[PDB]
Amino acid sequence: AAVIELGYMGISVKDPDAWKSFATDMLGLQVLDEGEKDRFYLRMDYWHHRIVVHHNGQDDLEYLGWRVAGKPEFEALGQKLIDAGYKIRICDKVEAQERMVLGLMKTEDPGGNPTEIFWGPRIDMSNPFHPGRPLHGKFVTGDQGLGHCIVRQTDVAEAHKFYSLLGFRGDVEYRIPTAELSFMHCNARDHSIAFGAMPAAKRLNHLMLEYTHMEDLGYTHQQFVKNEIDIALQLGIHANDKALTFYGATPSGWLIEPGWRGATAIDEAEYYVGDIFGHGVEATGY
């Protein structure tokens, strides 16, 4: 037992007001403002938060927060990382409290992406999720964590070694006429992290969030079209996770992938040379 979900993530942004409107109106996320001068939160479920939005930022990813079941797994994984030669820091109580977790360690993946491992998230059971716009349904989180990210890597083999140590499984799932793309899971979500060896100006290529209801995905798509927000890739279904998704611009320039109907992860490695349908390029430059 090691990493069990993508529990939270932090991003930094240059336009917090635009991000609040985008998150609520375009996606249906809930804005939680605790009156902090430099950040606010986005909720998806009973967790106090799933995304921390830092102000005065770089319009990129700040950290991914990977959950382990408890203290025993936290301690075991820490030692495992040390023994394998990785540089980690166990955080003090102030730093853990900043993230609202019971235990916290910080490191960087082989691509330079700041990576946090924690146990004991804060759950606000007294405060049920209340979406930023009316929703037919809710989000798929639970044992699948918040969603998935594709992040920049320079050495795919080293990236794979690192995430394997963290307890992820997966390998090259697409060979695109040849670019190889690798996808890894740490729970039932088909993938939680993925990467290839392509150049990228930003740490974060995209974040995928999953609705329980197709009606919310469709309405989200309609919101993007109505507000003339760039759709980088049109609606389609992935050969790996079988989800219906599209990719749209965020105010930070990296992409959001709203989706629906993701399939369960499998440990039997398969690869494909294309998607089931759709996901055609529309807006260029992403």
196 near ligand BP7 (CB under 6 A):
yes
Q: Which of residues 17-76 bind Fe ion (CB under 5 A)?
A: none
SS3 label, residue 154: coil
**Binding-site residue set for substrate:** 148, 190-191, 206, 247
Is 69 a binding residue for ligand BP7 by CB under 6 A? The answer is no
- Residues 169, 189: Cα–Cα separation, whole Å: 12
Q: Quick one: what does residue 171 bind among a copy of itself, ligand BP7, Fe ion, none, with the CB cut-off 5 to 8 Å set by partner type?
A: a copy of itself
* Residue 170 binds to Mg ion (criterion: CB under 5 A): yes
Could you list the residues known to form a binding site for Fe cation, using ranges: 148, 206, 257
Q: Which one, 89 or 130, has the nearer CB to a copy of itself?
A: 130
State the Cα–Cα distance between residues 275 and 121, nearest whole angstrom: 36
Does residue 187 bind ligand BP7 (CB under 6 A)?
yes
- Closest C-alpha among 69, 68, 269 to residue 169: 269
Q: What's the sign of the alpha-carbon dihedral 14, 20, 26, 29? A: positive
Q: Quote the radius of gyration of the chain (alpha carbons, Å).
A: 18
Q: For residues 243 and 265, what is the distance between their CA atoms, to the nearest angstrom?
A: 12
Token readout for 268 is 């039997």
The single residue listed with the structure tokens 């430099």 is 38
Q: Distance (Å, rounded) from C-alpha 83 to C-alpha 227?
A: 51
Distance CA 42, CA 258 (A): 15
Contact segment (CB under 6 A) with ligand BP7 among 95-103, 122-130, 133-141, 260-268 equals: 260-268
Give first-to-last CA distance, the chain, whole Å.
36
CB 113 to ligand BP7: min, Å: 12
Segment (H or E) for 218: helix 214-226
123 binds, among Mg ion, Fe ion, a copy of itself, none (CB under 5 to 8 A by kind): a copy of itself
Residue numbers after which the chain breaks, C to N beyond 2.5 angstroms:
177
Smallest separation, CB 15 to a copy of itself (Å): 26
- Which range in 90-98, 167-175, 195-203, 250-258 contacts Mg ion by CB under 5 A? 167-175
The residue ranges that bind a copy of itself (CB under 8 A) are 4, 67, 69-71, 102, 119-131, 133-136, 169, 171-172, 214-215, 218-219, 221-222, 225, 235-237, 239, 244, 261, 267-278, 280
Binding site for Mg ion (CB under 5 A): 170, 183
- Interface residue list for ligand BP7 (CB under 6 A): 150, 167-169, 174, 176, 181, 185-188, 194-196, 198, 200, 205, 208, 238, 240-241, 257, 264-265, 267, 275
